[PDB]
Amino acid sequence: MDPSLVLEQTIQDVSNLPSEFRYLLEEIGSNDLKLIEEKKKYEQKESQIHKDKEIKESLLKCQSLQREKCVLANTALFLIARHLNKLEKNIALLEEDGVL
Amino acid sequence: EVARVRNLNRIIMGKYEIEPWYFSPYPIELTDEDFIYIDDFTLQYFGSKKQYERYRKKCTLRHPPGNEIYRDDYVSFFEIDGRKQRTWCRNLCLLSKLFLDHKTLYYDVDPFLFYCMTRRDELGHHLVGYFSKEKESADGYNVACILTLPQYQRMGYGKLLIEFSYELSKKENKVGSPEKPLSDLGLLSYRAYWSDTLITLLVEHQKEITIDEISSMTSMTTTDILHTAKTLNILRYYKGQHIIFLNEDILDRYNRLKAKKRRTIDPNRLIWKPPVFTASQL
Amino acid sequence: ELKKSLQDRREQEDTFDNLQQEIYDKETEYFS
Amino acid sequence: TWNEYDKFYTGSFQETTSYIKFSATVEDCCGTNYNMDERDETFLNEQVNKGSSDILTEDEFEILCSSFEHAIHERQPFLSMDPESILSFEELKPTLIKSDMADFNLRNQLNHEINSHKTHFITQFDPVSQMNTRPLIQLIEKFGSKIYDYWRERKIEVNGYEIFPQLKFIDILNSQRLRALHQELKNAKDLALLVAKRENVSLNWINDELKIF
């Protein structure tokens, strides 16, 4: 009944994560489309010096398009991590228990 | 000699003064201090003066952490679980019982729902409405005492705010009530509610109808309709709870909804059953 | 050292895009 | 009114197209659990920087003395009113070789497998002031003894209190499935190692061109 106890500790906070599956991915896709169209926009400078007016600031605003993706994944790591602390230690609270 | 003890006198927040009205179980030594400051969004607790700009800077999560469920251009609808978020909600109900005298915070506060009404910002979401309704099935009682900060009143927040709280209640779809015993500034707002809602719900006859034809979209019972029928002074309609009509109505302010009846929140939202019913035996 | 430093842009498309295809590699172990 | 309220507000958040659901219990609503008064930096102004060359910064305070602050809770239920029942820094070493003082050790363990310790706890919750934050064992062997011996007499004189006022108040089929489904947050972390590699080949390109130009 200790596993039922910890199951009603855990379902309400594993449950808001497929809602975050709805959340965090569409900006990854939209920022990736902006990255590939922007790369097509700043290829021509390296081409014409290969055959600088825009390239460096465009790589910087590529980084502005991607650091928020990275911090979204890092907050994803954080909210994976604290519940995974209590999750694995509660798997351990089952294993050390006489139940499991 | 307990529920009529005021201890705070002053709060200044931003440009806005807050006067306390009722007794809440705060420590009386912080009532002894004069400054009562707080975070605008996350409500962090302190007792000092060398922390303001630094908690302001380190709080870049400038919202309420509730699960946002419906944000238009005007409203933004959260819910908070207090089993999920505790101590913020400890103080959140402490403020409500600082403005209401029928609640005491020692027994449990975890389960019951914390619905919320903010304006969105570009810094975050400024709290402009809230209430602490139940998780499920108290006494009927499909809403609870709805309280918010008093300086954002009288301009188009609070009245239609409690009416769409009621709308969510019959859009979580069950017959209930507010609190029974006492009300100081809202009972008149409760009959303003039930008159405005009843006239908008049953100017739509086209036949003869029982009162249960419309009571399903009320979250107030069929039997309440005669006392709401005699709040507005006389609308005896060959009385009987099994059938009613309406007269060619006098129409004081039926088609006078050009003020404070201007926006609609759509029923576009899910259901919020308890995943664990939480029969706490301890 | 300088020319390779300018053309690592020209040379790490393979790494950046097999990062792009690591999700194609992992979709079925997400089906576990 | 306030004159600090207008200088309070700066920056912005992700103004959603439709919905960013918020969910944060009070341990992740503000940041650090506590703040600083006049005396913890009066010590810095008058008894630290009179002739010193090495920097004693504010992020070193609110982590290093926070280690003792959180450590006397997990280690000491002995006296909640004690001026002097805490013992020294060197006997707090087992609670200071590790500092799970709101989760630094698994913060290291996550970006072990994300192998991006250069992202030393990057977040939007707490601000950009994060590249100043360096790990705490070198903070021990630079400042831990002196921040302890300034932080020790304070809890001698706040004598078991702190700076804040007081606040009064079927086994089967249920482990293998949660293993084989939080393997999906494990491989969500593998996607996180993946995107750490994305941003680090990105800044490979950045800092490669920056060590050109």
SS3 D6: helix
Q: What gap in Å lies between CA B130 and CA C20, rounded to an integer?
A: 44
Entry field: residues in chain A: 100
Residues of D in contact with A76 (CB under 8 A): 188, 192
Q: What gap in Å lies between CA B19 and CA D41, rounded to an integer?
A: 35
Q: What gap in Å lies between CA B32 and CA B35, rounded to an integer?
A: 9
Print the domain residue range for A15: 1-100
* Resolution of the solved structure (Å): 4.3
Q: What gap in Å lies between CA D147 and CA D56, rounded to an integer?
A: 10
- Cα distance from N-terminal residue to C-terminal residue, chain B: 32
Residues of D in contact with B24 (CB under 8 A): none
Contact A13 B84 (CB under 8 A): yes
Contact C5 D212 (CB under 8 A): yes
| Cβ atoms of D32 and B57 closer than 8 Å | no
| Cβ atoms of A56 and D206 closer than 8 Å | no
Q: What gap in Å lies between CA B128 and CA B185, rounded to an integer?
A: 18
What sign has the CA pseudo-torsion B14, B19, B25, B31?
A: positive
Tokens of D173: 């089929």
Closest residue by Cα to residue D209 from B138, A58, B157: A58
Consecutive H or E run containing B18 = strand B16-18
Residue A81 is nearest to which of D110, D122, D203, comparing CB atoms?
D110
CA distances from B174 to B219, B223, D133, D160 (A): 6, 15, 53, 51
Q: What gap in Å lies between CA C16 and CA A36, rounded to an integer?
A: 12
Q: Do chains B and C touch (3 or more CB pairs under 8 A)?
A: no
| Cβ atoms of D189 and A78 closer than 8 Å | no
Three-state secondary structure of B265-279:
CCCCCCCCCCCCCCC
Three-state secondary structure of D36-64:
CCHHHHHHHHHCCCCCCCCCCCHHHHHHH
Q: Locate tokens 């509730």: which residue?
A: B66
Tokens of C1: 């050292």
User: Could you give the number of structural domains in chain A?
Assistant: 1
- C19 Cβ neighbours under 8 A, 6+ residues apart: D194, D195, D197, D198, D201
Contact D25 B13 (CB under 8 A): no
Q: What gap in Å lies between CA A87 and CA D182, rounded to an integer?
A: 9
Residue B66 exposed, middle or buried by CB count within 10 Å (0-12, 13-18, 19+):
buried
Q: What gap in Å lies between CA B128 and CA B151, rounded to an integer?
A: 9
Give the ranges where chain D is alpha helix by DSSP (H): 5-8, 38-46, 58-74, 94-97, 105-113, 136-139, 145-157, 176-210
Q: Locate tokens 């302010």: which residue?
A: B253
Q: What gap in Å lies between CA A8 and CA D164, rounded to an integer?
A: 33
Q: Which chains lie within 8 Å of chain B at 3 or more CB pairs, if any? A: A, D
Q: Do chains A and B touch (3 or more CB pairs under 8 A)?
A: yes
Between residues 1 and 32 of chain C, which touch chain D (CB distance below 8 Å)? 2, 5-6, 8-9, 12, 15-16, 19, 22-23, 26, 29-30, 32
What is the DSSP code (8-state) at residue D26?
G
Q: What gap in Å lies between CA D38 and CA D66, rounded to an integer?
A: 17
Q: What gap in Å lies between CA B139 and CA B141, rounded to an integer?
A: 5
Q: What gap in Å lies between CA D156 and CA A66, rounded to an integer?
A: 49
Tokens of C20: 């792009």
Between residues 158 and 187 of chain D, which touch chain C (CB distance below 8 Å)? 180, 183-184, 187
| Cβ atoms of D99 and D67 closer than 8 Å | yes
Residue B146 exposed, middle or buried by CB count within 10 Å (0-12, 13-18, 19+):
buried
Q: What gap in Å lies between CA B78 and CA B128, rounded to an integer?
A: 12
- Cα distance from N-terminal residue to C-terminal residue, chain A: 11
Closest CA–CA distance from residue B188 to any residue of chain D (Å): 32
Closest residue by Cα to residue B188 from B156, B217, B212, B162: B162
Closest CA–CA distance from residue C28 to any residue of chain D (Å): 11
Q: Which long-range contacts (CB under 8 A, 24 or more apart) does B278-281 make?
A: B278/A8, B278/B83, B278/B111, B278/B135, B280/B108
Catalytic residues of B, which ones? 179
Q: What gap in Å lies between CA B159 and CA B153, rounded to an integer?
A: 9
Q: What gap in Å lies between CA B57 and CA D170, rounded to an integer?
A: 49
Closest CA–CA distance from residue A1 to any residue of chain D (Å): 7
Residue D109 exposed, middle or buried by CB count within 10 Å (0-12, 13-18, 19+):
middle
> Rounded to 5 degrees, what are φ and ψ at B77?
-110, 110
| Cβ atoms of B202 and B214 closer than 8 Å | yes
> From the centroid of its chain, how far is CA A27?
10
Compute the count of residue pairs across chains B and D with CB atoms less than 8 Å apart.
Answer: 120
Compute the count of residue pairs across chains A and D with CB atoms less than 8 Å apart.
Answer: 85
Q: What gap in Å lies between CA A87 and CA D175, rounded to an integer?
A: 11
What sign has the CA pseudo-torsion B153, B155, B159, B161?
A: negative
Q: Which chains lie within 8 Å of chain A at 3 or more CB pairs, if any? A: B, D
Q: What gap in Å lies between CA B76 and CA B129, rounded to an integer?
A: 10
Is some CB atom of chain A closer than 8 A to the CB atom of B189? no
Residue B119 bridge partners (DSSP): B126
Q: What gap in Å lies between CA A72 and CA A79, rounded to an integer?
A: 11
Amino acid present at A56: K
**DSSP-based helix, strand, coil % in chain C, nearest 5:** 70, 0, 30
> Rounded to 5 degrees, what are φ and ψ at B56?
-65, -40
Conformation bin of residue B154: beta by default, left when phi > 0, alpha when psi is -120 to 50: left
Largest CA distance in chain D: 67
Entry field: residues in chain B: 282
Largest CA distance in chain C: 46
Contact A12 B275 (CB under 8 A): yes
Tokens of D32: 């650090």
Is some CB atom of chain C closer than 8 A to the CB atom of D210? no
